[PDB]
Subunit: 62 residues, 6 copies
């Protein structure tokens, strides 16, 4: 399984590391797949490249 | 956060349901984000549409 | 420019056709790009393959 | 609905903002979905990371 | 490396098989990476889900 | 056809150029499509944004 996760910029490397570890275990337990076959890609979005309801995330999020 | 997960076809709806629930919480706890902002997309691949090392998964996986 | 749009299953072919036409023009006008260079991909998700807040869309949307 | 748009680097923040706003309204009108549920991700590509017909966009585009 | 390839529906399984094999080797030779670490995902688009220049591919391609 | 390739950061521009050229020809020969219609997007991943088996690629790859 491959997971690509888009998140707004801002998190710490520690949080991203945890994210990768947690999501990998979640996928592994859920599908009963070896943890070693799980790949996770984190794609960070700049506040000016994400829109919700038509507005920029920078005008509406931290 | 938005997560797209590519998995091989075959799992039950129960397993996918669990996948969606488990990955959502993992993301939520990890980034300390409200569980309600987390979206998860499961994309299923046909065994003849996934290749590892140049070989089809149908030739090399269950 | 290339746009991939993930939407829940259910729309008519007419609506999707309109989606493709309307998003293409929006991109074209917005970036001042020739309408002919714009590609649009519509990816439909099964209600059991999309989750919002940990819950399936089939349990939480029409 | 979620839209991911890949575009070559170069546009202004104003153009990207418009893109996000225009595409969101286009998706909303087309599908008759609340504008507030539409998310748009803009992924910018470096001229050296996009190829058309085998050539780099930097050799063949502004 | 992971490659996702979007192609119009219609090809035979033989052609897709070749696609997967040929792109895997191309990536392997190009990046000087072990062929065994290369994953390829083929995503097929329905003619009514792909638009070029605002028009559906079913209206404009075989 | 459109190809998006995720690779770890580190390659040279020459290698990426080759990758784009090789993959484009591979897709073109395989599908018997005009080379001019093939688009290739290279998305580079930071060693800290890719996980394999739950670990960061930075702890386990060059
Ligand atoms: C998930 C994409 C698993 C995989 O690729 C493998 O089985 O090696
Ligand atoms: C993750 C994509 C979160 C989000 O969209 C939000 O904060 O509403
Ligand atoms: C958007 C992806 C435009 C493009 O590919 C072109 O300029 O041909
Ligand atoms: C489009 C992806 C809409 C959506 O997620 C929602 O209904 O909240
Ligand atoms: C490409 C995504 C290669 C990879 O995952 C690996 O080195 O195992
Ligand atoms: C592959 C996506 C080919 C294409 O878009 C075209 O036929 O112009």
């Amino acid at each position: 399984p491959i997971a690509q996760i888009h998140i707004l910029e801002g998190r710490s490397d520690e949080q991203k590391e945890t994210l990768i570890r947690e999501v990998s275990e979640a996928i592994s337990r859920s599908l009963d797949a070896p943890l070693t076959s799980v790949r996770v890609i984190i794609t960070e979005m700049a506040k000016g490249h994400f829109g919700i309801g038509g507005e920029l995330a920078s005008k509406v999020r931290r």
